[PDB]
Write an enzyme that holds these catalytic residues in place. Structure first.
Site, mmCIF file in Angstrom:
data_model
loop_
_atom_site.group_PDB
_atom_site.id
_atom_site.type_symbol
_atom_site.label_atom_id
_atom_site.label_comp_id
_atom_site.label_asym_id
_atom_site.label_seq_id
_atom_site.Cartn_x
_atom_site.Cartn_y
_atom_site.Cartn_z
ATOM 1 N N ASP A 1 -3.334 15.412 72.293
ATOM 2 C CA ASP A 1 -4.597 14.993 72.308
ATOM 3 C C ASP A 1 -4.826 13.453 72.903
ATOM 4 O O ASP A 1 -4.218 12.794 72.536
ATOM 5 C CB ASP A 1 -5.367 15.083 71.094
ATOM 6 C CG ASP A 1 -6.535 14.552 70.914
ATOM 7 O OD1 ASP A 1 -7.108 13.606 71.664
ATOM 8 O OD2 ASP A 1 -7.462 15.364 69.799
ATOM 9 N N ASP B 1 -11.153 13.403 76.348
ATOM 10 C CA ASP B 1 -10.349 13.838 75.207
ATOM 11 C C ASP B 1 -9.978 15.364 75.595
ATOM 12 O O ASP B 1 -10.744 16.385 75.654
ATOM 13 C CB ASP B 1 -11.236 14.011 73.952
ATOM 14 C CG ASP B 1 -10.718 14.760 73.060
ATOM 15 O OD1 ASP B 1 -9.594 14.729 72.774
ATOM 16 O OD2 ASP B 1 -11.553 15.253 72.125
HETATM 17 C C1 LIG Z 1 -12.435 19.283 68.798
HETATM 18 C C2 LIG Z 1 -12.805 19.925 67.532
HETATM 19 C C3 LIG Z 1 -12.807 21.183 67.048
HETATM 20 C C4 LIG Z 1 -13.133 21.608 65.749
HETATM 21 C C5 LIG Z 1 -13.465 20.817 64.800
HETATM 22 C C6 LIG Z 1 -13.557 19.287 65.039
HETATM 23 C C7 LIG Z 1 -13.800 18.202 64.180
HETATM 24 C C8 LIG Z 1 -13.063 18.851 66.476
HETATM 25 O O1 LIG Z 1 -13.250 17.593 66.876
HETATM 26 C C9 LIG Z 1 -12.079 16.734 66.339
HETATM 27 C C10 LIG Z 1 -11.561 15.976 67.266
HETATM 28 O O2 LIG Z 1 -11.506 16.312 68.471
HETATM 29 N N1 LIG Z 1 -11.030 14.852 66.762
HETATM 30 C C11 LIG Z 1 -9.757 14.398 67.466
HETATM 31 C C12 LIG Z 1 -8.637 15.234 67.485
HETATM 32 C C13 LIG Z 1 -8.574 16.102 66.123
HETATM 33 C C14 LIG Z 1 -8.788 17.423 66.045
HETATM 34 C C15 LIG Z 1 -8.721 18.237 64.927
HETATM 35 C C16 LIG Z 1 -8.757 17.510 63.663
HETATM 36 C C17 LIG Z 1 -8.678 16.065 63.588
HETATM 37 C C18 LIG Z 1 -8.484 15.511 64.871
HETATM 38 C C19 LIG Z 1 -9.691 13.567 69.017
HETATM 39 O O3 LIG Z 1 -9.481 14.683 69.789
HETATM 40 C C20 LIG Z 1 -11.307 13.042 69.137
HETATM 41 C C21 LIG Z 1 -11.775 12.264 68.078
HETATM 42 C C22 LIG Z 1 -13.279 11.857 68.227
HETATM 43 C C23 LIG Z 1 -13.470 10.382 68.916
HETATM 44 C C24 LIG Z 1 -14.337 9.554 68.289
HETATM 45 C C25 LIG Z 1 -14.400 8.216 68.739
HETATM 46 C C26 LIG Z 1 -13.659 7.667 69.615
HETATM 47 C C27 LIG Z 1 -12.572 8.523 70.402
HETATM 48 C C28 LIG Z 1 -12.538 9.840 69.763
HETATM 49 N N2 LIG Z 1 -10.973 11.173 67.904
HETATM 50 C C29 LIG Z 1 -10.680 10.964 66.459
HETATM 51 O O4 LIG Z 1 -11.206 11.159 65.345
HETATM 52 C C30 LIG Z 1 -9.459 9.844 66.434
HETATM 53 C C31 LIG Z 1 -8.333 10.278 65.056
HETATM 54 C C32 LIG Z 1 -8.939 9.647 63.939
HETATM 55 C C33 LIG Z 1 -8.416 11.763 65.111
HETATM 56 N N3 LIG Z 1 -9.765 8.490 66.638
HETATM 57 C C34 LIG Z 1 -10.820 8.040 65.798
HETATM 58 C C35 LIG Z 1 -11.600 7.090 66.306
HETATM 59 C C36 LIG Z 1 -10.694 6.085 66.854
HETATM 60 N N4 LIG Z 1 -9.576 6.654 67.657
HETATM 61 C C37 LIG Z 1 -9.224 7.665 67.310
HETATM 62 O O5 LIG Z 1 -8.137 7.988 67.686
#
Ligand SMILES: Cc1cccc(C)c1OCC(=O)N[C@@H](Cc1ccccc1)[C@@H](O)C[C@H](Cc1ccccc1)NC(=O)[C@H](C(C)C)N1CCCNC1=O
Ligand SMILES: C[C@H](CCC(=O)NCCC[N+](C)(C)CCCS(=O)(=O)[O-])[C@H]1CC[C@H]2[C@@H]3[C@H](O)C[C@@H]4C[C@H](O)CC[C@]4(C)[C@H]3C[C@H](O)[C@]12C
Ligand SMILES: C[C@H](CCC(=O)NCCC[N+](C)(C)CCCS(=O)(=O)[O-])[C@H]1CC[C@H]2[C@@H]3[C@H](O)C[C@@H]4C[C@H](O)CC[C@]4(C)[C@H]3C[C@H](O)[C@]12C
EC number: 3.4.23.39
Length: 329
Positions: free
Chosen positions: A214, A34
């Protein structure tokens, strides 16, 4: 001198995993990779949650190079949250390996129902320094300051259903990856692989709007209101309760995303965001688009977008380079 990389495997077309290994014993772990999370985790054998009983667990007993920070953690995503404690150990990658501060995980509880549903084991973050919980230095940047890499970059070539495999290479750019000229986009930031693009789809536009690039997001995300303007008279249909739409694969009204900058212009066409689901019904695709409102108007160019464009994340040039991938092996 064929460079280093890792085999990353299409999972039904939705998303991909590169397997990697913590510990001198190179203990197995299949991961999400990621860009956007700045931290790597894996589930300890001290894990107490049903989640864990599914894939491989870290025993720090079996590591020679193990060191213990011991400080309790809680990793939060929007998709949910894993919590555990901090530890140290070496982590090998392709042909390359070093000693890293990582989050031994012992609690999936709040990452269900998706984790126990998945195959991946942990999430290798590939993000930015200032965005690490516990001050962690990103991998790719360590391989530079340790002279282990020829440039402090990482390059993402994504796979395709039954068509070709994918490769995250770490240092240099493999030419066999793209055709048409790499365009670099400045980071409008210093904690996130996000740039300033001018997103249009038909009559509808947005201009000068943060686009996050991302690797650990398997959809495009779009400002909810923009997505509504988008769907006006398009013969697609929200699933009840879920923020996902479905449509005939053939639906001729399905638009083509177009992104402008001062530098370059990029475009996504339905075939890349349509997700066949015959499983439900005939020539029935699910859209691979979610509506998501940040405080500032933002998209997330995820798997669909990347599986289109060969894509390079350069820390030193604070930029993302983008060009069109190749067809097959
Ligand atoms: C890195 C970060 C900093 C501050 C705050 C938060 C919440 C942060 O984390 C949020 C984050 O990274 N979320 C996404 C992008 C992000 C950054 C900021 C706000 C919102 C999103 C992405 O990169 C990774 C994250 C996690 C994940 C969980 C399970 C499997 C794979 C990945 N993946 C997901 O949530 C994604 C979608 C729904 C966005 N997702 C959900 C599942 C299935 N596949 C998929 O695509
Ligand atoms: C991130 C956004 C939410 C944006 C938002 O803004 N929603 C309000 C949050 C609640 N509060 C208002 C209380 C916040 C705190 C108050 S504050 O005002 O401080 O913000 C939410 C809304 C719907 C969510 C997806 C779906 O579920 C389906 C699916 C379930 C899986 O399992 C995990 C993956 C996935 C894709 C989910 C990811 C993510 O999770 C989504 C996009
Ligand atoms: C969320 C907080 C700010 C606190 C806050 O949110 N203050 C009020 C805003 C109104 N809300 C959105 C809560 C309303 C919800 C209404 S609801 O309907 O949901 O109830 C801010 C502070 C720092 C912000 C992150 C960083 O920049 C880095 C990065 C930039 C990308 O570009 C987007 C992703 C990311 C991870 C950012 C996400 C988010 O932006 C953060 C956490």
């Amino acid at each position: 001198s064929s460079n280093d990389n890792i085999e990353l495997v299409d999972f039904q077309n939705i998303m991909f995993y590169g397997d990697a290994e913590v510990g001198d014993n190179q203990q197995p772990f299949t991961f999400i990779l990621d860009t956007g999370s700045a931290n790597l985790w894996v589930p300890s054998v001290k894990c107490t949650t049903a989640g864990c009983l599914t894939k491989h667990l870290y025993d720090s007993s079996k590591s020679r190079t193990y060191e213990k920070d011991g400080t309790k953690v809680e990793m939060n995503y929007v998709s949910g949250t894993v919590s555990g404690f901090f530890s140290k150990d070496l982590v090998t990658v392709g042909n390359l390996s070093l000693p890293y501060k990582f989050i031994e995980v012992i609690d999936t509880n709040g990452f269900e129902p998706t984790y126990t549903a998945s195959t991946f084991d942990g999430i290798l973050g590939l993000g930015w320094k200032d965005l690490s919980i516990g001050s962690v230095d990103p991998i790719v940047v360590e391989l530079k300051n340790q002279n282990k890499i020829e440039n402090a970059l990482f390059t993402f070539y994504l796979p395709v259903h039954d068509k070709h495999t994918g490769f995250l290479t770490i240092g240099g750019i493999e030419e066999r990856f793209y055709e048409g000229p790499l365009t670099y986009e400045k980071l409008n930031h210093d904690l996130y692989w996000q740039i300033t693009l001018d997103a249009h789809v038909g009559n509808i536009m947005l201009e000068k709007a943060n686009c996050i690039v991302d690797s650990g997001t398997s959809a495009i995300t779009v400002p909810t209101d923009f997505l509504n303007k988008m769907l006006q008279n398009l013969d697609v249909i929200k699933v009840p309760f879920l923020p996902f739409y479905v449509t005939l694969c053939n639906n001729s009204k399905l638009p083509t995303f177009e992104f402008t900058s001062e530098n370059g212009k990029y475009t996504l066409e339905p075939e890349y965001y349509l997700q066949h689901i015959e499983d439900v019904g005939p020539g029935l695709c699910m859209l691979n688009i979610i509506g998501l409102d940040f405080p500032v108007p933002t998209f997330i160019l995820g798997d669909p977008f990347m599986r289109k464009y060969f894509t390079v994340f350069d820390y030193d040039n604070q930029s993302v380079g983008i060009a069109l991938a190749k067809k097959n092996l």
